[PDB]
Design a protein around this nucleic acid. Structure first.
Lengths: 53, 94, 93, 51, 109, 82, 108, 93, 81, 95
DNA sequence: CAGGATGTATGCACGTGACCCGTGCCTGGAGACTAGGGAGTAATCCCCTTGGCGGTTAAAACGCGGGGGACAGCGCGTACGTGCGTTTAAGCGGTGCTAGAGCTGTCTACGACCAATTGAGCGGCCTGCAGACCGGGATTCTCC
DNA sequence: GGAGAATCCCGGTCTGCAGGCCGCTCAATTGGTCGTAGACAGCTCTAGCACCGCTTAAACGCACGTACGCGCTGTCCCCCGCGTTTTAACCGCCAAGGGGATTACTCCCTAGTCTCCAGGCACGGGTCACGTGCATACATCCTG
C-alpha cells in the first residue's frame, strides 16, 4: 500500500505543479489579472488568443 | 518471529490513528434489533440510528478498556482481567 | 411572611403507612427535598419531551413517558399504575 | 442517472480542455511539432509570452 | 380503582393526600411549558405520593428494627441504600446526617 | 427471529477495541465479560430510544431518539444532530 | 462602534445571528422575559467558543498536512486542550477517534 | 420544507480565524451539534439564575453569570470580555 | 486567615477512612487527602460565592451551597431545597 | 494486656459506621471555609447553616472517596491505602 | 561487457465524488409605535452574623516499642501471542415492493384568562411524650 | 480453660422537640367566554426492508514456544496501640451592628401588533481534486 500511496502523493504534487503552471500562465495575461478563479478551459482559450495577438 | 507483545504495540498505534468503526455493521444491526425486540416488537431503525449506537457504544467500550488498563497497571500487571473491568465499573458506578 | 412545604402531606402519608410512627423535623426536611427533586425531574423531562416534539402542552402522556424514563425497574411500573389510577378516578363520573 | 449525466458533462469538459491544450501547443514555436506535457505547454506559453 | 367521593378539592376528587392544586400551581409558574393539561398535575401528584409512601414504609421498618418510634435521617439513609430501586433513583444524593451502611469487607476480618 | 447475535461481537473486534484503548495483553475471559457489559449498556440506551419513539407514537427509532437517550445518560454525542 | 450596518449582529460586530438567538431564548421557556442585550451577549459567547475550536482544528489540520477540517481534527483540537476537554469531556464525537497515547509500562 | 443551521456562521468564523482552510460536511454537522449544546447549557443555566432570584427576566447579568459557571479557566474570562464588548458596542448606537 | 487546612488533623482523616471501612492508612494519605479536600472546597465555595455575588448579597446562604452541589451532580438533602 | 494491631481498627470501623456524627471539628473547618472564601470575595458573611451544609458535603464526599480507595488497595492485594489508591480512584471516577 | 526478462518509476487518460458559484423564492428580522408590568431606588426594621470572654474538657500531638505488613527476588507452568491455510460471512452493486414519515387542510375540544367566593393550611402557641443521658450490673469478645 | 476489657441491658432522671389547637390570609375552586393547539382524515413520496449474485477481506481452527502471572520465600521498614503531655474546640453568654427582608413609588424596557424588505435556503450548473488502469522509459539480474 506504501507504493500506491507514493504514486498518489507524487501525482498529487504533479497536480500542484500543474496548478502553479496554470496560475503562472493566467497571471501572465492582463485580461485575466483580476480573474484569479478563471477555469482551465478559459485560461487555455484566452491564452491562445493572447499569444496569437 | 517477533518478540511477543511487539505486534500489539503496532496494532495499538494503527487503531488509535484510524477513525473507522471496529465492530462489523451487519452483526451490530442484528444485535441492536435483537435487544430492541425485547422492549417492543416490529420497530424500524433509521439507518443513522444504528450508526449513532455503534459510535456511542464502541466509544464507551474504548473508554472502559482504557480504565480497565489502569486497574491492571495499578495491580502491577500488564494483562487485563475481569477484576479490572469490575473495579472500573464499580468506581464509575455502572 | 409565609413559606409553603409538603410536610403536612408527608405526615398524612406516614400516618397511613405506619399509624403509630412519628417523624423528626430533619427527616421531614429530607422528605420535603425528595418531593422537590422528583417533581423537578419529572417536570423537566416532561418539558424536554414536549419540546422534543413540537408540542406546547404538558399532558399526562408526557408525564407517563417521563416516569417510565426516570424511574428504575419495578418502581416505574407501580408509579405508572398509581398515576393512571388517580387520573381514572379523577375523570370518572 | 443524473449522476451518470454529470459524469458525462465532466467527460465532455475534459475533452474540450484537451482540444484547447492541443491548440495552445500548436500556438507556441518552442513546442510546434514537439511532444510535451500540459505543465510544459503552460510553462512554455508563460515564458513565451514573457519573451 | 375505587368509587368517587364527592369533594371540592381536586386531591379528594382524585383520591390523593398530595395537593393537586399546589402541583398545578408549581407546573404553571415553573416555566416547564406554555400550557399544562388538567390531568397532568393529577398524574404527577399520584406519582409523588406513591414514591413518598415507599420511602416512609421502608423508613418505618428501619425505625422499628432500631427499636425507635420516630423516623430520623439515619432511618432514611438505611431505607434508601438497602433498596436497589431507591438506591438507583437516589444514587448521587447525599442525605444530611445519614451516615453509611456498615460496610466491612471480608478480606479485612 | 433474531437470537444470540451477541456472539457476533468477535474476539478480534473486542481485541481491537481494547488495543485502541491502549491494552497490550487480553485475558481469554475478557470476551465473555465485555459482551455482558456491552449488552447492559445497549439495553439501557435502546430502552430509552424506544421510549422516546413510543411516546412520539412512531414506529421508527431515529438518530435523534438515540442522541436524546445518550444526552440523558450524560454521554452526549455530536454529528448525528443536537 | 465604527460599524453600523443595521442587522443586530452587525451593530454588535458579530457573525452569529442575534435575531435567531433571540427567538431561541424566547422559545423553550427559559424565562417569561428576555432582555435585548441577552441574545447579543450570548451570540458573542457562541461565536467566541466556535472560533476557538475552529482555530485549534485548523492547527491540527495543518499538523496533518490537510487543507480541510475533518472530525478527527475536531477530536484532537478538543482533547489536546484542557479548557475544552473539561467543557466537552462528556462528549463523544462522530468519527473523532482517540488520542495517540500508550502507557509507558507497555513499551520496551 | 426548511430547517435552519449555524453552518454559514461557523464557516465565516473559520475564514476569519484562518484565512484559508475548508471544512468537511461531517465536521460541519459536529459544529452544529456543538453550537446547539452550548446554547442549551447557557440558556438553561440562565433560567435557573433568574428563577432562584424570583426574576422573570433573563438579562446580560444572568448570561454572564451562566458563562462564569459553565466555562472553565481562561474560556470564562475571555467569553465574558467578548460578550461585554459586544453588548457595549451594540448599545453605543 | 492562613494555614487553616492544617485544621484537618490526621485523626479526622483516619475517622473518615474508618467510615470508609479502611483498616490501615499509609503516611502519604494525609497530605493527598488534604489536597483533594481543598480542591473540592474551592470548587463548591467559588460557585456558592458566585450565586451570592449575582444576588448582590454579602451573605452566603445554605441555598448557595445547595445550588453549587447540584451542578456537580451531587444533590444534597436536608438544608432546604 | 494490649489489643493486637488491627483489632482496634476494626472496633473503630464498627463504631464510626454505627454513628452519624460529624467527624471534623466544627470550628477549624469553619476557619478553613473562611480562608478559602478570602480568594473569591473579600469580607463575606457566612450563614451558620451554609457552614454546616459545606461540612456535611465534604465529609460525605471524603467517606465516598475512602470507600473507593479501599477498593483500589484491595485490588492491589494490599491492606494499606496509599496515594496511588486515591489518585487511581479519582482518575477512574473522572476528576 | 551487451541484450532480454523482469521489476521499478513516470506520465497520460478516464470515471467518481466533492466542492464552489449563481439564480429565484420565501420566511424571517427589523423598524415604528404602543401599553403594561417588572425591576430599580429610597427608607425602614429586625434577624443573624461577627467578635470577644471565661472555664472545662476531649481531642490532638508526641515519643516509643513492637509486630505485621509491604517489597524484591526466584522458579515453575500455563495461557497467551504469533504465523499459516481453510472456511465463512461481510461488503458491494443491483432490483423491486411497501410502511411509514411527512405534509396539508378542516374542525372540535381544551386550557388560558377573568371575576367572585370560599376553606385548607399556614404561623404561633400550649402541652405532654419519646429521646438522650447517667449509674449499676451481667453478658460477650479478646488475648494468653 | 482462665483473666480481663468492651458492649449491652435495665431502671431512673430530665429535657427539647413533636404534635395538636386556634385564628386567619391567600391559594384553590367555581362558572363562563374566547382563541388556539391538537386530533383526525387524506394524500404524496422517501427510506427502509427483503432478496440475489459476486468478489474478497476477516475470522476461525491449529501448532508451536516463552513472557508473563502466580506462588513461595526472605528482608526490612513502616504504622498501630499505648501512655503521657500539650493544645484549642466547645459551650454558654454577652454586645454591636451590617445586611437581609419588606413596602411604597416611579420610570424604562420588553411583549405584542402591523408593515415592509433582505438574508438565507433549496436547487441546478460548472469546476476541481482524487484514485485507478494503461502505455512509456529506466535500473537490476541472468547468459555467454
Amino acid at each position: 500500500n506504501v507504493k500506491r500511496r507514493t504514486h498518489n502523493v507524487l501525482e498529487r504534487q504533479r497536480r500542484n505543479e500543474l496548478k502553479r503552471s496554470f496560475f503562472a500562465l493566467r497571471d501572465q495575461i492582463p485580461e485575466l489579472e483580476n480573474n484569479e478563479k478563471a477555469p482551465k478551459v478559459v485560461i487555455l482559450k484566452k491564452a491562445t488568443a493572447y499569444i496569437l495577438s | 518471529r517477533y518478540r511477543p507483545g511487539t505486534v500489539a504495540l503496532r496494532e495499538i498505534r494503527r487503531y488509535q490513528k484510524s477513525t473507522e468503526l471496529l465492530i462489523r455493521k451487519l452483526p451490530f444491526q442484528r444485535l441492536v434489533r435483537e435487544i430492541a425486540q425485547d422492549f417492543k416488537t416490529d420497530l424500524r431503525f433509521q439507518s443513522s440510528a444504528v450508526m449513532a449506537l455503534q459510535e456511542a457504544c464502541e466509544a464507551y467500550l474504548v473508554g472502559l478498556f482504557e480504565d480497565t488498563n489502569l486497574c491492571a497497571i495499578h495491580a502491577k500487571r500488564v494483562t487485563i482481567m475481569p477484576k479490572d473491568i469490575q473495579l472500573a465499573r464499580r468506581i464509575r458506578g455502572e | 411572611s409565609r413559606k409553603e412545604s409538603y410536610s403536612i402531606y408527608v405526615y398524612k402519608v406516614l400516618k397511613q403507612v405506619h399509624p403509630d410512627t412519628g417523624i423528626s423535623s430533619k427527616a421531614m426536611g429530607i422528605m420535603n427535598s425528595f418531593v422537590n427533586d422528583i417533581f423537578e425531574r419529572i417536570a423537566g423531562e416532561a418539558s424536554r419531551l414536549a419540546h422534543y416534539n413540537k408540542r406546547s402542552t404538558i399532558t399526562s402522556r408526557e408525564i407517563q413517558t417521563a416516569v417510565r424514563l426516570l424511574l428504575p425497574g419495578e418502581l416505574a411500573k407501580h408509579a405508572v399504575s398509581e398515576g393512571t389510577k388517580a387520573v381514572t378516578k379523577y375523570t370518572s363520573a | 442517472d443524473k449522476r451518470a449525466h454529470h459524469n458525462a458533462l465532466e467527460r465532455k469538459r475534459r475533452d474540450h480542455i484537451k482540444d484547447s491544450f492541443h491548440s495552445l501547443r500548436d500556438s507556441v514555436p518552442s513546442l510546434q511539432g514537439e511532444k510535451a506535457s500540459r505543465a510544459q505547454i503552460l510553462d512554455k506559453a508563460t515564458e513565451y509570452i514573457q519573451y | 380503582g375505587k368509587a368517587r367521593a364527592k369533594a371540592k378539592t381536586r386531591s379528594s376528587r382524585a383520591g390523593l393526600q398530595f395537593p393537586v392544586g399546589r402541583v398545578h400551581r408549581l407546573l404553571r409558574k415553573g416555566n416547564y411549558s406554555e400550557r399544562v393539561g388538567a390531568g397532568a398535575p393529577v398524574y404527577l401528584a399520584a406519582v409523588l405520593e406513591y414514591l413518598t409512601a415507599e420511602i416512609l414504609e421502608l423508613a418505618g421498618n428501619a425505625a422499628r428494627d432500631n427499636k425507635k418510634t420516630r423516623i430520623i435521617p439515619r432511618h432514611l439513609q438505611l431505607a434508601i441504600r438497602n433498596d436497589e430501586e431507591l438506591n438507583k433513583l437516589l444514587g448521587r444524593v447525599t442525605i444530611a446526617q445519614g451516615g453509611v451502611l456498615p460496610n466491612i469487607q471480608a478480606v479485612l476480618l | 427471529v433474531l437470537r444470540d447475535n451477541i456472539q457476533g461481537i468477535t474476539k478480534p473486534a473486542i481485541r481491537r477495541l481494547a488495543r485502541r484503548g491502549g491494552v497490550k495483553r487480553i485475558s481469554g475471559l475478557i470476551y465473555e465479560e465485555t459482551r455482558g457489559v456491552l449488552k447492559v449498556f445497549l439495553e439501557n440506551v435502546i430502552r430509552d430510544a424506544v421510549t422516546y419513539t413510543e411516546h412520539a407514537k412512531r414506529k421508527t427509532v431515529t438518530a435523534m431518539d438515540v442522541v436524546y437517550a445518550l444526552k440523558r445518560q450524560g454521554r452526549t454525542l455530536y454529528g448525528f444532530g443536537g
